[PDB]
Ligand binder design. Structure first.
Ligand SMILES: *[C@@H]1O[C@H](CO)[C@@H](O[C@@H]2O[C@H](CO)[C@@H](O[C@@H]3O[C@H](CO)[C@@H](O)[C@H](O[C@H]4O[C@H](CO)[C@@H](O)[C@H](O)[C@@H]4O)[C@@H]3O)[C@H](O)[C@H]2NC(C)=O)[C@H](O)[C@H]1NC(C)=O
Ligand SMILES: *[C@@H]1O[C@H](CO)[C@@H](O[C@@H]2O[C@H](CO)[C@@H](O[C@@H]3O[C@H](CO)[C@@H](O)[C@H](O[C@H]4O[C@H](CO)[C@@H](O)[C@H](O)[C@@H]4O)[C@@H]3O)[C@H](O)[C@H]2NC(C)=O)[C@H](O)[C@H]1NC(C)=O
Ligand SMILES: *[C@@H]1O[C@H](CO)[C@@H](O[C@@H]2O[C@H](CO)[C@@H](O)[C@H](O)[C@H]2NC(C)=O)[C@H](O)[C@H]1NC(C)=O
Ligand SMILES: *[C@@H]1O[C@H](CO)[C@@H](O[C@@H]2O[C@H](CO)[C@@H](O)[C@H](O)[C@H]2NC(C)=O)[C@H](O)[C@H]1NC(C)=O
Ligand SMILES: *[C@@H]1O[C@H](CO)[C@@H](O[C@@H]2O[C@H](CO)[C@@H](O)[C@H](O)[C@H]2NC(C)=O)[C@H](O)[C@H]1NC(C)=O
Ligand SMILES: [Mg+2]
Ligand SMILES: [Mg+2]
Ligand SMILES: [Mg+2]
Ligand SMILES: [Mg+2]
Ligand SMILES: [Mg+2]
Ligand SMILES: [Mg+2]
Lengths: 165, 139, 139, 139, 165, 163, 141, 163, 141, 141, 163, 165
């Protein structure tokens, strides 16, 4: 249990007072016969460590329109923010999740920390839309369907078959 | 009679579908001589080596920010397109224009088709059939 | 004998007048075979489909800031030029260079003329007849 | 049988030596019909006027910062290359792509050779034989 | 007539003094028996509203080399600037009026507030110069002149006729 | 009525035929006997000037999503385009009309050729809104209302008065 | 007791009204000593010369060409129905995403009853984070 | 087993031949009598799907100095490339993995498709180095060591304690 | 009486001579209290530590590559025939048209008879508007 | 005696340790009057409100996208094992070669024994020249 | 004197002809009997090296408004260009020579290949002018004139002295 | 010899004291009967002119990692910096000397004040490397060597000859 020096005001003896734990602060210092009085941190304030503050640190962190509370102001921790759904964090900003264009598909959806991840559509697959969730899907397989090939596909348009063979 | 063709940008050229571009084949500077057309493709009927070409006019405002413009073959012998000639441009480097030209000789058989694609199609700007076009002639 | 031609950038190529560019027709890589020339225009004397082409080299310092490079037909049947093939570039995006190439097949009759224009002409940089040129051949 | 050729970008295309680019001549879209090849040059064996062309795909990250892409003739009658058709581009204006296309008709004699150079070669990006290529046909 | 509170210095009575009108300021406050003495604003100063300043606001506005006085310092108004002829106002700067290139013409000349306005030359008209006043003018009409067409015109060069027909 | 030279296709003497007027073209050239025969332009085609074309010019101009026909195709003219309401023409593009931020107001509204023009609100005036129409208005005059001043105004806020 | 104050960026700082910014006056680092506050204005209770200052942290994604940001300190007096500009910066800092900071300090004479406020046009470019990046203060000299 | 139309080269009636499977191509088309004959792909060539090609497709894909074969040429597929260790794929380029500067730490390591992800070190934690692997570690806990505080820590420096 | 001063941008501010900027000293917001002025220099009459400060508003159209602007506060003493640099910024703010603002503050010891001036190279990039955007002041601490 | 200090950029200023910057405290323009110093921290010996300030001169060649520079003044107290942020700027000034300057001033209350330090992340972008371009000071108000 | 292979146009045996020197070309190839005949280059043409060209190379180089002929066309060389006075060569362009702003002076003047070089004026020196020639001069020495100091100098202003 | 006014502290007479020369400062002012005592500047300080400082100016100039001392701190002059070898001075920075690409050659090597100077290789010469010292060198001359030409050269590759003729 860590300590801070003090002095009885009546006598003058050195004291070794106890510090206050996370979630509290020093409301009254120790005396010869009573220990340090630790107060609970009042709303909107905090202390996250063992400490001897005469007042708690303020929850100073503000969340923008594009952010929500990853953590609330609590007596043991400041508030903290992450980006809302639809957005990710680049360089202190919350940017919109990119869409993958036609010809390319999502390999990882975007998160609060990470942007949409796109590769170009590998052979035999396609994406025809700009989308931030559409993945490269496999071409209509005319031979598996027993049908005749009408127009071959590409990375951005599905293969077309006839309706017979 | 040596096959040749020149198709021009048209009102209906951008379908927004991921497919090839469509073109005008008959009016104005557009024409077909010994080649056919079908939902955006030149269709070859006389086998031979062809110089093929295309130019697309591009434009926008600011900036996925790379543009591919390419010519692609279809054959009914294989269920996927073959890439023939391709460019990547990133010209958004407020307003901007840039033009992409492709030309090259390829061997085409009767029944094979060539088409043009641009990704993202959104960036193609039509004006009058002179800035975006697609053509070929046998050599 | 199949008409063909290739004209090169020349000292007198930029007249500053709003007119077409002029070119060299005889010396160095320049030549005329079954086509004629006149104050900057190729003049057709055998009717047919021609692949026409031009490349201009552009350059400057900093930046009305859009450049058109185009090939244009004149016929004496109508008192205005017809646009054939055109590009807009805005490449000033200190020093800069950019090249514009145009090619395409058009039908030309005996007596029709083709010319090249650039607006603003000021931005064309001549060096040696290899960076800006204008040519054609029948196909 | 009309000479024609189309050579494609290949694995060995950038030698880093200051010399011309090398190319594929046989596989895929590459072919030779009435022309020969030799350490990067098309070699002419039938004299005539040829439309020659090349496209190189360029790319990099940031920025001596001017790129020349050119087609050049060799004749054994003179101990230096002749420039035929050339472009300067400064497209670095993080990632970037740009494509350069050159085409033009020149007269070539039996024994003359044409090659392609890019300075700086470092900036050429190969992908699959469709973005950088070199070809010709007689006209 | 608006008022400001005051107090006679001899007696101590509350007073309701009159404010001074635009072009003046309070030189002497009112008293029990005399009204407020309004002074005229001295050169280089002003008051634009009813007021009780003990001194006029200064004409603080400065005009750059590219500006002239839209309004002079006057006792009722600060100085104010607009751009000189040849220039217009964009974003606190005075920029030079653009020229329209060859192939394009002036539809509105530039003003202090507005830049030159250009369209591209419509069919049958032209402009051959870079100019900030030249408009798209109509082509020489060879048929109206009874003469033979020599070279057709374009958006940037006039049509040419021969001298006969 | 202007004219053009023609050889007769079998006789080969210079004839001097009449051209065809705007809205028409040469269906059949003149001969020994008969005047030039002029057909009218088919749909989607035009001739604006006197001519001897064997086929009308094609109405080749295309209007984009942000454009409308300022002139339709017609026998005597091509189509032309201008920007739709909300946009103006800058470098061959239709950009959106600007908003004037707070502390500045509209002097000239946007049009098809011109952007919204703005200025700082001069003394005694305000605009509290980003807007592409809202102009610099004058401050509430507390004195001309028989009221005292509460909080002074600025280029972006109205002056306030008390009861 | 020499007057001083330091007011910090807060959740309600950006009203969007076209009025001046609001600030925290009591919590964390914010304080008033011999100055008062009212609706975003510091309110002078002791006549004299003050160094006033303000910093605002700006940032965004690209520019809207309206791409000039003004930051300024303005005085209000009850004797004249308009504000007086004191100290002002123009920045066009966006020359993808960007951050810039604007500082202003200087000495002015202020009478009791006069007020000072801080305006940024366009307000939407101010980025609040934690009270340490945008702020407004003064002390008597 | 799908099929394609063919005319016999001398008889000229429609025959219905079988296609060739992935990894093969048509060495010789079917006739009156015999089934389609399918050869295997020569080296450096492929057919990924059922087909009637007279020649396999060429393995045309090239890997650059900063790429390795994610799939080799094979009879049934082209070559494919991914970035080497140290680089990630951004716009068809292999860029170097980022370092997280001091005051910030690694949450997700770089991979062939994704850049190093970073964040500010939250309270009670630190990173004193630019590094593409080093993460936000917690401050030395002076109290949980029976030591007094010397100098407090920050997002970029460890808290120090005394004897 | 604690010395203080605040001098404002004025019509004659930019001499073009290569000398220091000139300022207004009496009108509008400009004032001297226990400091004097001479040819653009503040002139110290009471020895001690001063916080000096200056802001200049810069702006232009494009850069001339000479594209670095220095803004600085410089001391003159009669004991040495050269100026001493005190506080200096370099900005290259033009990275069409642009605005940036440069602020400088700090404490220095000054003897009676010493002077402080403000230099901007290149002077032509300073934009005067109304006395609130470029300025020069000090007060004793 | 009213406390004041002004510390200047010096050869050892940039430790690279992730710690705060170091400064000159005795030579040329640097001075301490009623403040102390220790390992880059100003150390308060007299409780009260201080205006603290810092300028750092930044510069480089291009950006590394890590392209945001933070400059800040931070407080240390012996009662809590973490630093408290006081005043902070973010700049992304590199929008070839560039220079920008960041200033910070404001008033804070400081007790005896508390300390203030200056941090720049990333430290490598600070350019020292002569002690006049990067600096750190304070005085009591 | 080097040589080239030639077939006789009717006999067809390998002959070994002499090349033509710089400034000339092959008017007529060698034969059975006679040496190669070399003509001189017509105007506007050249051959710089030994050769067997049937036509001289064209002097194809063009100098622009801001360039002058550093070498004229000649029988043995093409034209070449350098920048005019006032400009220097940077990236194949002729840019204007820089001015050194006040507080800095010229150390090396501009030339056709190099821009004006500048530096900050060191202590004891000045330049009060933007100029592409004016250098850092030393301050007036008040002491070496028997005068007292009036106002001290700077990198951009001369020191002043009194009577 | 320049002077500064003073006053004897005992009597009160005006004095005309001598200033101190470069490399010194006033340690003691003059008196009625002794001249001014000039002290030598202590290490890390200087005075470069005649002067009456009570202390020398500090050598405040710092040299970055890319710089070395053009001049040392000396009693008559501050320290001063130039760029190290490999680097030159542009706009207060020390930049790396450019390399000339293939097809171009060094006409002047780079110095502390000046960047590498390149022209494009003139006809009959070449450079095949990016180098900051390689100059345009002349092509292998096959006719001077008596050998047959194999492949002609260019601005970026040397001419090749066979090994015979
Ligand atoms: C040289 O001069 C001759 C005059 O001798 C001139 O001929 C005229 O051209 C104009 C433009 O083509 C013609 O005007 C048209 O007339 C017809 C009716 O005859 C109208 O239908 C036309 O269309 C209008 O209709 C739209 C409504 O849907 C309108 O919105 C729009 O305004 C259209 O213009 C148009 O008015 C005119 O008929 C001829 N005149 C004669 C006598 O033939 C020629 O154009 C001039 N040439 C040059 C090169 O400048
Ligand atoms: C439509 O459906 C049919 C199914 O009816 C499908 O045919 C299959 O295609 C796949 C892909 O070409 C074939 O899978 C291959 O099989 C061979 C062995 O027979 C393997 O050698 C192949 O190679 C693998 O080897 C590498 C090792 O060096 C591995 O790294 C890599 O994973 C390779 O894939 C591969 O597995 C399969 O044989 C046929 N199936 C049949 C029954 O013929 C066809 O592809 C579908 N078409 C479309 C257009 O989607
Ligand atoms: C506000 O309203 C009052 C009207 O009651 C205006 O009073 C007049 O102001 C003009 C300005 O030059 C004076 O000449 C007149 O003397 C005023 N009123 C009277 C009673 O004579 C005042 O100007 C208005 N303020 C404005 C428009 O800004
Ligand atoms: C540092 O270490 C001490 C362990 O000795 C931790 O003490 C505990 O902190 C939690 C936090 O909520 C309290 O609930 C407990 O009361 C603490 N200890 C005891 C004895 O009960 C302290 O939290 C640690 N600090 C950290 C992890 O930041
Ligand atoms: C200014 O002029 C005087 C000449 O009257 C110079 O005086 C000499 O300065 C040098 C510098 O090292 C000293 O060693 C000499 O002692 C000086 N003069 C005498 C009388 O001995 C002075 O240096 C000049 N200042 C300059 C060039 O900056
Ligand atoms: Mg997609
Ligand atoms: Mg015009
Ligand atoms: Mg508004
Ligand atoms: Mg780290
Ligand atoms: Mg100078
Ligand atoms: Mg080299």
């Amino acid at each position: 249990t860590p300590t801070y020096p003090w002095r009885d005001a009546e006598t003058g003896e050195r004291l070794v007072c106890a510090q206050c734990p996370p979630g509290t602060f020093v409301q009254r210092p120790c005396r010869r016969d009573s220990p340090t009085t630790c107060g609970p941190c009042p709303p909107r304030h905090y202390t996250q460590f063992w400490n001897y503050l005469e007042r708690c640190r303020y929850c100073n962190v503000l969340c923008g329109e594009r952010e929500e509370e990853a953590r609330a102001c609590h007596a043991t921790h400041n508030r903290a923010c992450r980006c809302r759904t639809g957005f990710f964090a680049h360089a202190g900003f919350c940017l919109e999740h990119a869409s993958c264009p036609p010809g390319a598909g999502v390999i990882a959806p975007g998160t609060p920390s990470q942007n949409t991840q796109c590769q170009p559509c590998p052979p035999g697959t396609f994406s025809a839309s700009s989308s931030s969730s559409e993945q490269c899907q496999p071409h209509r397989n005319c031979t598996a369907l027993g049908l005749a090939l009408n127009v071959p596909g590409s990375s951005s348009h599905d293969t077309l078959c006839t309706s017979t063979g | 009679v040596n096959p040749a063709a020149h198709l021009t940008g048209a009102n209906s050229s951008l379908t927004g579908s991921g497919g090839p571009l469509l073109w005008e084949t008959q009016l104005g500077l557009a024409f077909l001589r010994g080649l056919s057309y079908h939902d955006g493709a030149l269709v070859v009927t006389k086998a031979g080596y062809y110089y093929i070409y295309s130019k697309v006019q591009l434009g926008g405002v600011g900036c996925a920010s790379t543009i591919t413009h390419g010519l692609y073959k279809r054959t009914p012998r294989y269920p996927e397109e073959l890439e023939l000639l391709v460019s990547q441009q990133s010209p958004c480097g407020s307003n901007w224009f840039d033009s992409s030209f492709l030309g090259g000789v390829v061997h085409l058989e009767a029944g094979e088709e060539v088409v043009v694609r641009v990704l993202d199609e959104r960036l193609v700007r039509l004006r009058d059939g002179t800035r975006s076009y697609f053509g070929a002639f046998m050599v």
